[PDB]
Design a protein around this ligand. Structure first.
Ligand code: FMN
Ligand code: FMN
Lengths: 186, 272, 186, 272
C-alpha cells in the first residue's frame, strides 16, 4: 500500500505525441523530415531492441502523389543496410477499400503509409513471431516519438485488408504483415 | 502539320522513362514502345508493307498490340483493327473489304525474333493526308477511312482543351475496333500520359476498381458504359482521381449526370 | 531505386539508449527517479497507444532488498488510476532459477524487475492478444527511452520461467505474462 | 534478567508490523502473535494452567504452533514438545513422565473461539529461574529441564555475537522437539527477525529452494542436514542471502566446509 511521486518528469516526445488523424493535405513532407523519420531503423547494430539480434521486421511504405518532396508515388521497400528506398510498384496504389469502417478518412488525409512485415526466418521456431509482434510495437513507439521531434502526425491501424497490399509489395509466403501506420498535421 | 506516330515519337524524346502503357503486370516505357515498334516496323517493311497498304491487327488487350499498331503507322501503312471476339466470317469480310495485305497477332515480336532488327528512328513515309486507320461500323459493315491529320487534330484539340499531361492516366475500356480508342492510345501518347489497359470491358466491378487501384484520371467512353459501371458501385463510394469524363453520344440516361458527380466529385463531365 | 538523407536528426533518448546489462549494485534508485520511470503508464487517457482505448497490459514489478529508496523489497502491482504501488507479496522473491541460461547474471546485478501482463478482457475476441503483444513493445520502448531521460539501464527478457512468478503475483487464468524487463548502470 | 516470552514481548513493541513467522502462505506479525498468544494464555489459565505446570504441545509445522508455545510460557508454565510423527506409545511415555496437565493441538485458537478472550498483556508469572521447556532425548527417553534464564542467555549470546536483527530470516528446519529449535523460535523473536517454517525437514530439494525463494539468511542445524541438502543442489549453484551457518556437533563430514563456501560464499560457517 504505497504512493508514488506525481511530481516531476519532462515528457516532450512521449506526452507531446498522440494518435493523429487530421493532416495538412497540402504541405509536402520535406525530403529531410521524411529521410529522418525513417532514420530510426537505420542499421549489425540498430537504434531499437530486437530479440536475439535478429531484427526480422521488414518495413515498407506507400507514398501518395506529390505529398513528399523528392519521392514519386508508389510502394517502396526501405533497406536498413543502405538507408535506401527501392521502388517495388508505382502503377498500383492503396485505396479506401483496402481499409475498413472507421479507418476510411484516416487514410484519406494521410500523406504516406508505413507497413511492418515479420520476415519469418529463424532460432526460436515459431516464438520468433511472438517476439516480432513486440518488435513491431517497439518500432511503432520509436517512430511515433521521432515523429514528435518533427511534428509528423501518426496513427496506428490494427486491422486492414492486407489481401492485395500483400501482392503489390511482392511479399513471400514467409512474409506476413503485422502492423500499419498512417503518417504532417494541423 | 502532324501524324499520329510522329506525335508519339516527339513525346518519347521528352519523357523516355515515363510509363506509356500498362496492362496487368506488363508495362512499357515511352522509349521501350518507340524502340520495339521501330523494329516491328522494319520487319513489316521486309514484308513489302509500305505506303498505301492496309495491315490487319487483332485487337487483343495486351501491350504488344500497341507496339503493332504503332509499327504499322511507322512503316507508312494504315491499320485495320480486327475484333478477336468476332466470328471468323465477320473478320474475313473486313479483311477482304479493306484489301488488307496481312493480319498481325500479338506475340509477333517474340516468335519472329524481331529484337534482331534495328530499333532506331525510321525514315518518314506517311504524310498527314495519308490514311492512318480504317474503322468498320454497324455490324453490312461499312469501313470509314481516317487520315493522320483528321485524327491528330481531334486528339490534340482534346489534349489542349483539358490540359492532358504526364500526370494523367487513361483507362482503355473501349475496343480498339471502336473509334473512341484512337484517343485512348494516341491521345495518351501525344500528351505523355499513361494508358492502363483492361482485360474485359464487360466486367463492370473491375472497371470501377481499376479507377481506384491505378489512379485513373480520364474516362472516355459512350454514356452506356459509365451508366452500367455505376450500378456495381457502393452507395457511399467516392473517387477523387477521376477528373475528366468524356462521354460521346446524344443519349444520356437522365440520372447519370447527378450519379457521376456523387461518385466522382472531382470529375468534369463533358458531352461531346 | 532511391537514396535518402543520412545527414541529420538528433537522437538523444533513442540512440543514447541500449540494452544494458551491467548495473551499479550499490547506488539505490532515488524515489524520484523510480516514481518517474513509472510515470509513463500514469493514466481515460495514457501516454502511449493502445488498440481501441483498451489498455489491457497490467504491469507488475519486483524490487530487490534496499536497492530503491523508499520501497521495501517485494512484488508490487502498479495502479495506473492512482499512480500507486500496492504490495502483493514481500515474503517470496524471484531467484536465478526463475531465469535461465544466458540471463542469470543479468538478473543478478539488476535492481528491479518490470513485468507486463496481458489482462485478457474484451471487443476483439482473441485478436486483443495480438494487439496486446504490440502494446507490450510500445510500453517497452517508452520505458527504455524514459529510462534514458534518467540514466536508468534496461534489458528485455524474452523467455523466463513465469511458472511460479505467476503465483507470487496472484495472477488469474485470464492474466498471462508477455514480457519482462530488468532495470542504474556504470 | 530475562524470560523467553518477555524478550519477545519487548520486541513486539519495537516492531509491531514486522513479519514474525511465515509457513507457506500463512503469516503472523509480531503484534498478531503477541495478541493471539495472550488470548490462548488466558484460555489456559481458565483451565488451571499456571506456575509449575507442564503443557504438552504437538510440534506441528504451522504458525499456530508458535502461538501455543508462547501462550504456555505466558501462562507461567513450561511446554513439552511432542513429535506428531512419533508412535502413540512414545508420545504417551513422554506426557506421563513429564507430568503434563494437558496436550495442545493446532486449531485450538479457532475451534474454542479464543478470539473472545482479552488480547492485552498479562500479569507476569514466570521467573528467570522457572522451567521454560523440557526436551526429551535419545529415543529410555530422558527429559532435560531448561530454565528461562539458561535459554535466554544462549539465544542472546548468539544474537549479539552475530548481530541478528530485523533484516534476518531464519529457516525453521529442525523439529521443535529438538533443542536447536529454541533458537529458531525465540532467538528469532528476540532479535526482531522472521521465522520461515518448513513443512518436511526431509525434503532436501525444498530446503535449498526455500533458502533462495524466501531470502534465508541464517541456517541453524546439525552438520548432517546441511550435508544432505548440498547433495540435491546444482554444480554451479550459488546463494548470497545466507550469511550465517550455525552447525552444532563435533562430527563434520570432511568436504562439507569447502562445499558450504562454494555454494554459499557469503555464509560464515560456525562450529559451536
Ligand atoms: C496495435 C494498435 C492498433 C490500432 N489500431 C487502430 C485502428 O485500426 N483504428 C484506429 O482508429 N485506431 C487504432 N489504434 C489507435 C488507438 O485506437 C487509439 O488511438 C488509442 O487511443 C491510442 O491513441 P491515444 O494516444 O490517442 O490514445 C491502434 C493502436 C494500437 C496500439
Ligand atoms: C522481445 C525481446 C526479448 C528479448 N529477450 C532477451 C533475452 O531473453 N535475453 C537477452 O539477453 N536479451 C534479450 N533481448 C535483447 C536483445 O537480445 C538484444 O539486446 C538486442 O541487441 C537489443 O539490444 P541492442 O539495442 O543492444 O541491440 C530481447 C529483446 C527483445 C526486443
Amino acid at each position: 500500500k504505497i504512493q508514488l511521486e506525481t511530481s516531476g518528469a519532462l515528457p516532450d516526445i512521449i506526452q507531446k505525441r498522440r494518435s493523429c488523424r487530421r493532416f495538412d493535405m497540402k504541405t509536402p513532407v520535406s525530403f529531410a523530415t521524411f529521410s529522418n523519420l525513417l532514420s530510426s531503423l537505420k542499421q549489425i547494430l540498430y537504434n531499437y531492441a530486437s530479440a536475439g539480434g535478429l531484427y526480422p521486421i521488414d518495413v515498407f511504405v506507400y507514398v501518395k502523389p506529390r505529398r513528399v518532396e523528392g519521392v514519386k508515388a508508389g510502394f517502396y521497400y526501405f533497406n536498413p543496410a543502405d538507408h535506401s528506398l527501392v521502388l517495388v510498384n508505382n502503377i498500383d496504389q492503396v485505396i479506401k477499400d483496402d481499409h475498413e469502417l472507421i479507418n476510411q478518412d484516416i487514410f484519406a488525409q494521410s500523406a504516406f503509409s508505413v507497413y511492418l512485415v515479420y520476415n519469418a526466418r529463424a532460432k526460436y521456431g515459431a516464438a520468433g513471431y511472438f517476439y516480432a509482434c513486440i518488435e513491431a510495437g517497439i518500432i511503432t513507439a520509436t517512430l511515433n516519438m521521432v515523429a514528435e521531434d518533427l511534428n509528423v502526425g501518426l496513427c496506428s491501424i490494427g486491422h486492414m485488408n492486407f489481401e492485395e497490399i500483400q501482392t503489390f509489395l511482392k511479399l513471400e509466403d514467409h512474409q506476413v504483415i503485422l502492423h500499419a501506420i498512417e503518417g504532417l498535421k494541423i | 502539320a502532324a501524324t499520329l506516330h510522329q506525335l508519339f515519337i516527339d513525346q518519347a524524346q521528352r519523357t523516355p522513362d515515363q510509363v506509356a502503357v500498362v496492362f496487368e503486370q506488363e508495362w512499357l516505357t515511352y522509349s521501350e514502345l518507340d524502340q520495339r515498334s521501330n523494329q516491328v516496323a522494319r520487319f513489316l517493311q521486309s514484308r513489302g508493307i509500305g505506303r498505301g497498304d492496309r495491315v490487319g491487327v487483332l485487337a487483343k488487350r495486351q501491350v504488344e498490340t500497341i507496339i503493332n499498331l504503332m509499327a504499322v503507322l511507322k512503316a507508312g501503312a494504315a491499320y485495320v483493327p480486327i475484333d478477336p471476339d468476332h466470328p471468323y466470317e465477320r473478320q474475313t469480310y473486313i479483311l477482304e473489304n479493306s484489301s488488307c495485305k496481312i493480319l498481325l497477332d500479338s506475340d509477333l515480336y517474340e516468335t519472329m525474333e524481331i529484337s534482331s532488327y534495328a530499333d532506331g528512328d525510321l525514315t518518314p513515309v506517311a504524310e498527314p493526308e495519308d490514311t492512318a486507320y480504317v474503322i468498320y461500323t454497324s455490324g453490312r459493315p461499312k469501313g470509314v477511312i481516317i487520315t493522320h491529320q483528321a485524327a491528330s487534330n481531334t486528339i490534340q484539340d482534346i489534349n489542349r482543351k483539358f490540359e492532358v499531361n504526364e500526370e494523367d492516366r487513361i483507362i482503355g475500356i473501349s475496343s480498339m475496333c471502336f473509334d473512341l480508342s484512337v484517343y485512348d492510345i494516341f491521345g495518351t501518347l501525344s500528351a505523355g500520359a499513361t494508358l492502363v489497359m483492361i482485360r474485359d470491358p464487360r466486367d463492370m466491378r473491375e472497371l470501377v476498381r481499376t479507377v481506384e487501384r491505378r489512379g485513373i484520371t480520364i474516362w472516355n467512353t459512350v454514356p452506356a458504359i459509365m451508366d452500367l459501371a455505376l450500378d456495381h458501385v457502393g452507395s457511399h463510394f467516392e473517387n477523387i482521381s477521376l477528373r475528366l469524363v468524356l462521354l460521346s453520344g446524344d443519349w444520356i440516361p437522365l440520372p447519370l449526370p447527378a450519379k457521376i458527380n456523387r461518385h466522382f466529385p472531382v470529375a468534369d463531365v463533358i458531352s461531346l
